[PDB]
Amino acid sequence: MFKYTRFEKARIIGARALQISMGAPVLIDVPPGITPLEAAILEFEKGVIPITVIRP
């Protein structure tokens, strides 16, 4: 997006990790044995993010 503050990045990664843990599929191939959180960081770094942030 335009620019992601620290809090917004943390929130997005946390939400994606929770969704992945609860059963959501991963849209990026990942190495075996990774925790859901690190899968979320890999997904964010790849740039594919499905969660947008609402600004006032």
């Binding site: 620290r6 809090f7 943390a10 946390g14």
Partner: protein
């Protein structure tokens, strides 16, 4: 087998970092989880009936609207202690 103390200073530190959900997890989630029903016009703690399988307001006599709210055991006890005196805390409910 006691637990370590997470005092007020640690609370201010965690606020300063800006980690709200971490604060929630360290404070409430792992200690004193609670659920409470409250009527939507008095705010008094609604009294559930295990015999009749129906929640109701004893003070208010209400059953049309009763909601279930998560809270801490300490806060529930503080409300009870305030009601021990003549202090009446009226709870206004809202939906997220």
């Amino acid at each position: 087998e006691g637990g370590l103390r997470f005092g007020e200073m640690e609370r201010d530190v965690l606020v300063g970092h800006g980690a709200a959900m971490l604060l929630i997890e360290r404070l409430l989630e792992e200690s004193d989880k609670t659920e409470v029903w409250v009527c939507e016009n008095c705010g008094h703690i609604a009294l559930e009936d295990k015999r009749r399988r129906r929640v109701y307001c004893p003070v208010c006599g209400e059953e049309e609207r009763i909601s279930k709210v998560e809270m801490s055991y300490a806060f529930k006890l503080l409300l009870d202690e305030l009601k021990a005196m003549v202090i009446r805390p009226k709870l206004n409910l809202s939906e997220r």
